[PDB]
Design a protein around this nucleic acid. Structure first.
Lengths: 154, 118
RNA sequence: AGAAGGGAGCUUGACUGCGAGACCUACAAGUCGAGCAGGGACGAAAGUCGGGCUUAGUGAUCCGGUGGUUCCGCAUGGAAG
RNA sequence: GGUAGCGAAAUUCCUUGUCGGGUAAGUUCCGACCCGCACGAAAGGCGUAACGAUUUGGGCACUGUCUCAACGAGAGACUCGGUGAAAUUUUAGUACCUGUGAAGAUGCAGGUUACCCGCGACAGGACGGAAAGACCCCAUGGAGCUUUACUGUAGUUUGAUAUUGAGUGUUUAACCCUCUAACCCGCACCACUAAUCGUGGUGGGAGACAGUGUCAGAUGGGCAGUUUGACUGG
RNA sequence: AAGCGACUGUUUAUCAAAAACACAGGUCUCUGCAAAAUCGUAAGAUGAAGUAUAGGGGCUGACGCCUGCCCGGUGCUGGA
RNA sequence: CUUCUAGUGAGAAAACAACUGCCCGUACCGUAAACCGACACAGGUAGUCGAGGAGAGUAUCCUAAGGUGAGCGAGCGAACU
RNA sequence: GGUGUAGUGGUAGGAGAGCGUUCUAAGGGCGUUGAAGGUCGAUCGUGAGGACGGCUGGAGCGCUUAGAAGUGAGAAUGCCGGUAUGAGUAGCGAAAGACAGGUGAGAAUCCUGUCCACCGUAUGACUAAGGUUUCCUGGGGAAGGCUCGUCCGCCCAGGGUU
RNA sequence: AUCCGGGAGUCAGACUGCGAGUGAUAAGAUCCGUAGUCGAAAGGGAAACAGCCCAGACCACCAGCUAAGGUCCCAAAAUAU
RNA sequence: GUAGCGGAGAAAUUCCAAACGAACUUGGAGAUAGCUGGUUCUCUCCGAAAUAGCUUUAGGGCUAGCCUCGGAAUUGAGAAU
RNA sequence: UUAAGUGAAUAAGGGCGCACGGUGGAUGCCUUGGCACUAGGAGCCGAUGAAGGACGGGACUAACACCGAUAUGCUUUGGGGAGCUGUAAGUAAGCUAUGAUCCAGAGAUUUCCGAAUGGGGGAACCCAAUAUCUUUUAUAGGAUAUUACUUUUCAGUGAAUACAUAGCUGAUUAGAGGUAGACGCAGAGAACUGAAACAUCUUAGUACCUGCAGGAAGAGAAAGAAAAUUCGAUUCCCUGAGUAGCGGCGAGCGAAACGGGAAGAGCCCAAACCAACAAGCUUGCUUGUUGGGGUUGUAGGACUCCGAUAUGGUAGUCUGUUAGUAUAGUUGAAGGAUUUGGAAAAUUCCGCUAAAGAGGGUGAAAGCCCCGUAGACGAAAUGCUGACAACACCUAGGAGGAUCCUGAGUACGGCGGAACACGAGAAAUUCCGUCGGAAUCCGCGGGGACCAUCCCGCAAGGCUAAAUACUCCCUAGUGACCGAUAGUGAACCAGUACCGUGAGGGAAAGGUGAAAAGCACCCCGGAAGGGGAGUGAAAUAGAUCCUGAAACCGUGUGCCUACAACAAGUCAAAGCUCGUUAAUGAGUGAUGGCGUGCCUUUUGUAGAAUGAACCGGCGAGUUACGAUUGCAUGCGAGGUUAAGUCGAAGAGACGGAGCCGCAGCGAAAGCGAGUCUGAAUAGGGCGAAUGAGUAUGUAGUCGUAGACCCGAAACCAUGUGAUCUAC
């Protein structure tokens, strides 16, 4: 009510005019008036305790393993960043669904080659979230990255 | 995230107005008039489902009295006579006989006359 | 009227710490109480006595005064409080 | 402890007091009487020519004011052509009598009366329309006013101390004095200078007073903020 | 013929024009001039380019005849 | 405007001729349909001029110079206002 | 799952379980061989409500599971808009016109004439405020003008103040 | 029924038996005690009728038995003995 | 020229831009109101009160009484004869 | 034929159902404009004439945008490569491959008003003085410069009053005003409200007004925090803690230090003393001006003694050398046929591309058509930020303890007020007014009245980056934010039209189509409008143009209606008319029974108690932070991190200061499974005796905030009015 650019004057009198008592041109029931209880700027985020974060990470990767949906590979090497060779590699292992590609480190040619494919997501081994693993159908992780994940989840 | 009140109220109100077809004037055309009238009709219909069962019983009873006074009896004596003989016809079938099969009605009236002759 | 009424002798229980259990009651308050311990009055004893035949005679808290105290006391010993 | 003057009054409750006048008939009017509920001498008493779109009582003249109404002229109203609002409004196929009922019904009960649709007229009803009663009580509501209601205060006044210096005397420190250099001058003359402002300069007056700062006692509806209980056959 | 107000005047723009207000005349009181009084924190102003036969405040209200008794109370003035 | 001096201070009086002389307003209404009244509104609006007969007259009635017929009509000739 | 027995009026108010709207994510779908919306039907469920078919319409929208909310309207002498009733009703704002002839699609109302009538210390003439182009000429007739209009202080184009 | 805990709403009642006060042993009056209905209760009777008499509606039926109150016609049932 | 804690008043609470027992406009400001009005979908289970005490209290509130939901507990504690 | 009886049909107008139209602008879909933020830049303009305006400039020019008599534009350096002269049609004249138009950097011109400043004034107007130049034979006329006020420096002139100071003239130096409706520091400073009244108190040193700023301000280098064993300038965040306190001890107000972090930085004077100069020439060395020295509590300096005469740094400049960066741009992969349509990006086949599958456009939905994107490249000019160079500044030890220095009307005290969380209180500490008024290292201040002892510091002088606050504005983006009654008041020529003397108040109003192909020609008509014919996939898409709901107004018809008292229906029902989501079918209905709207407030309503003309849209228990209970999950005698750092505005690890629980009793000293009262080991109070918590999510209630929405009469503080009315 008080933020709308408007009036502080009582528009008519309080009695006599055969009217209904009104207080301002900008009241909630007037056309063009102010809003009662709208949206305000808010936060929306909170934190769960630390043991259940770790329990959810372990549980989601262990579910991936319990159904032969994780696929380990020795290495992913590329002399140039080529999308076509990555697609051939992807069919070499018979992968036909949404896949999370978990890479190690400055393996930059592989991440470049795997971008831009509309079924493929790329994450490094220090930056896996719970929402990345649940949304994909499989995980394609390299041997190096697997030990690096075992080093931080401990 | 704002919610316009688009098409829900018109559907509900048009459902109400369709029940008011055949009413007089502004009682089948304006929503408030029709709303009140339809509520009153609901009340009347519930009341009249129970009053129906009384009306037909009085109708049957008066036709049976009319028929029995032609066979030398009245309604109350003939009902007593039929009970003392162990006959269990409805008042519905009795009236139906009274209008369609006068000979069957006379057979029954004679049985009643012999029962309370004791 | 086995006096709670009325006379005579001696006295200060018109005591201190309390209290099982009840009564009344929205709360806060109000009422009765056997019995235990300290030290006593009256009586030869048994005993009775924590005012008056019973039920009116009174006013939360805050704040201030007087007396006691083996309590505290802004670095320490006191003091102010 | 109310004099002169006046008095049923612009004042007298009882009261249409009593008596005389005026009318055929006068609770109003005029004259008088005194038993002034509750007149009275500058919030003046008692007269008073002239004057008043003042208030009161009576006469002559004149009249439709009335007995008691009639006729006539014009404008609206009425019919035809052009134009074209409003307050109001739960939906309505919207009679009368006697009852009933939140105790005065078009609509409910029992009767009685009544073919369908309009035009010109009247105001008995729709507790008719217009204005969330101005009367009365409440809100631990307001606002304006008063005062010997509470608590403050502007203004006025009185003392101490700073600005603030110097000499004599009179008594138990205080006091009366005298001086001139501070401080003051809405006195005169002079310059800045076109000036009744201002600043400087010289005389004159007055003087440690006054004015001004800090602290203290009085007074203070002039002005301000508030308070002024409940029960209750309203 | 009688009441009220001496009179001409003024008043509630828009329900009250009057017996209300004003008035010429009476009386009490304040004020020695940088007057008292009033506007303003002050500077500055009105009073007044006036000076007690003048200026402020209260009451009464032409003119005629008159205007009694009380100073205990309250204000005001003087006292020591 | 008119005098009198003080005054930096060749020698200007008046004849004819011919030349020079800036900025702002200026239409139209204005006792009204053009202003103030929300209206093409029976209200309000300072000043000058304002004729004849009869009359003291700017009163009154009828007229001169000038202006105007007013922005809904045609019938009828009841009640009532 | 069967079978018995018992229960099932309700204001203030407590408790349970659901219907529908918009948006987000994931999944599986539809659409110019016609989405949403609109209109009609004699259809289904215990309720809020859900479908299917015709006509209209022209580009987007369902369903499942979970999440988030400006999430549901009949009432406040509510606020804004549109339209009724009163009703073809009140009123059309002081006053004298009549006829002939013009113009024109069309005339009581515009033009020209003739007679009649009204003001005349004004309803005549001039001017200061105020207004600000309303002034003149040629065209126009949708709105303004309380009727009409060929007319105008209205509308369009040009011009006028020395 | 009692005990612990989460969430309330109510603090204007009315009439009718019965028994008392105020009143005039008046009031559809007023103020208490005790039982019911209404409040928050539809259905039958009492002409119409919150509170009186009978009786407590989950729903369908063109089946049957009764309550209070009734049986000449309006209007169902005896012109009963 | 005089302006709202104000002005002006031959005095009426009179006037200060159609409103004056204290003008108009903006802001504090979404002032406060134990009062009045309104408060939007569905079905299932249960279901009150209109009293006591205290109250600058009497049409407001608080604690108890009377409703609803979840738990615990020995029982044979509740009711009617 | 006569009597007695029974009796249909016929609508002036009305009702119900259905069909088609009109008005009106709801609903759906859509966006041109908004709202809340993130990252980066920038944080002032102005007498060398501002912010904001007035009036002008075009071939035709009313308006908006641009520009200023050089007026729809002029020069110059770069970019770009075929059209162009804005909106804006329409026509007329032109320009451009000798490079237009357009884009970025630097210049030039810039009327008049306004601080407005030669004098005046009712803003955009009027009137001058002095020099130089012009028109005219000449006067009149035109142009250009200069001319306010104050301060602060210097000459000339100068006086009541002689010497000279007031003054005056001239030259020089700076100000002056606006704003970003924000953020900061000061001066002055309310009220309604809460306390269920109201004075202390609260609202609150808040709102409003005035001054001064800066890009940030303010504070800042111990006369400090503490208590043994200490630490070292300021600011900001977490925690301590709703604690210790204050309080008609009521309503309510409410710390700090320790501990954990972001950022870190220190410096300069006065004084003693020593020289150069001038005056007092005491020719004593008193007054002073310049330079040196010297800056502290472990006391430091002067002064005398010797060493050294080097070495560590800066918070500095419009000085050079490069490196980057902001302001234009360049280049940038890969598709055809088929079916349905007016038109494919859709469907079906068969291919290709990706360091590019972000987004927008194209006649419907596109990786491969266009603009782009990932990646690679670029600057003549001007401005910013680094680095390294110069130049400028600043900085030494050891000893001695004879004497001198270390901020005076100051610290402090009485009286009156205020600030500290602290309301005079037992009131320390810090300020303001008034009066009184120290000491000098054998000293002076503080540790919450006061004293003694111990401990920590050294006032009465100056400056200083960062870590923190804010967004008028420019660039690039983001959203389980709006979608035309919403979102800004304003999507559109809006602070406009309109209202008011004024201050001030203040709107309504988006949508043809893919493409204007926007209806040539004919007919009725003065025109408007309409009918054909044409455009087009569609005109019932025809400009009042997408969709096109309801109220409300009409036209046509199947059934009913002129002896009838009607809250308008409901139950029973003949006749007539139809024939559906196909089933115990649909519309109408003579006649018969029964039946007093909806909402609110009430003991109680049909109420002659209250509200609503009708239809459509909008219109009311929300969020933040705390406290408690139920449910749910993870750990379990334990549970858990806050600020902050790295990270995509995210997850996703570090971080153990801190918080709760694990032991109570007592006013406290204190004792402890017990403790307090008590002489008591007595009795009693409160506790123990296996007796579960903690973090997070979710829902119910409560507190502080407007706290479910609407509604006064009033109160206070700035400003605008005597064009009406009073004097």
């Amino acid at each position: 009510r008080s933020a709308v650019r408007g009036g502080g004057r009582k528009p008519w009198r309080q009695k006599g005019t055969g009217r209904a008592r009104q207080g301002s041109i900008r009241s909630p029931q007037w056309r063009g008036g102010g809003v009662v209880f709208g949206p305000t700027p808010r936060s929306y985020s909170y934190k769960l305790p630390k043991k259940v974060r770790r329990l959810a990470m372990k549980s989601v990767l262990s579910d991936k393993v319990a159904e032969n949906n994780l696929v380990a590979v020795e290495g992913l090497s590329f002399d140039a960043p080529k999308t076509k060779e990555f697609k051939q590699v992807l069919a070499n292992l018979s992968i036909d669904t949404k896949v999370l590609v978990v890479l190690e480190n400055g393996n930059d040619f592989a991440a470049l080659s795997a971008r831009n494919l509309p079924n493929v997501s790329v994450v490094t081994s220090d930056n896996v979230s719970v929402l990345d693993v649940v949304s994909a159908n499989k995980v394609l992780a390299t041997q190096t990255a697997l030990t690096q994940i075992e080093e931080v989840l401990a | 995230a704002r919610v316009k009140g688009g098409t829900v109220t018109r559907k509900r109100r048009k459902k109400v107005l369709k029940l008011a077809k055949g009413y007089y004037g502004s009682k089948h055309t304006l929503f408030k008039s029709a709303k009140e009238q339809v509520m009153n009709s609901y009340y009347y219909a519930f009341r009249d489902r129970r009053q129906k069962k009384r009306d037909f019983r009085k109708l049957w009873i008066a036709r049976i009295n009319a028929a029995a006074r032609m066979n030398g009896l009245s309604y109350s004596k003939l009902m007593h006579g039929l009970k003392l003989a162990e006959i269990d016809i409805n008042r519905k079938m009795l009236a139906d006989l009274a209008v369609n099969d006068a000979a069957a009605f006379t057979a029954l009236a004679e049985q009643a006359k012999d029962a309370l002759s004791k």
